[PDB]
Structure 1
Amino acid sequence: TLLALHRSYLTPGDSSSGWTAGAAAYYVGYLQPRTFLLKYNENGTITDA
């Protein structure tokens, strides 16, 4: 993942230590082949599987 740094005046002022990034999060889950039963709504959306 690419990252964002919330650089401010309070930081030292360099590329190695000057950063106050704060809160950030992500989840990674691997995918594998499986058989799924899909239910389709009258409109067309998949309500549940």
Structure 2
Amino acid sequence: GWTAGAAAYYVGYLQPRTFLLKYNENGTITDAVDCALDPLSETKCTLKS
């Protein structure tokens, strides 16, 4: 007999992968683009745009 309230946590595993990071004028990250997920993402990250 016990209670634990209400909670939920997610556990994910990281993998070695290249990411294209977008930086604004403030200096923070706004979006990220993959290279090994979608062909469109690969096209976006190979053109660096």
Tell me if TM exceeds 0.5. yes
TM-score band, normalised by the shorter chain? 0.5 to 0.7
Between structures 1 and 2, the one with greater helix share = 2
Give 1 or 2: higher strand fraction.
1
Give every structure 1 segment of 4 or more consecutive aligned residues whose post-TM-superposition deviation is greater than 6 Å.
none
Q: What TM-score, normalized to structure 1?
A: 0.57
Structure with the bigger RCO (C-alpha within 8 Å, sep 6+) is: 2
Identity %: 97
**What residue ranges of structure 2 are gaps of 5+ in the alignment?**
33-49
5+ residue gaps, structure 1, are 1-16
Name the TM-score, length of structure 2 as normaliser.
0.57
Query: Which protein is bigger by CA-based radius of gyration?
Result: 1
Matched length: 32
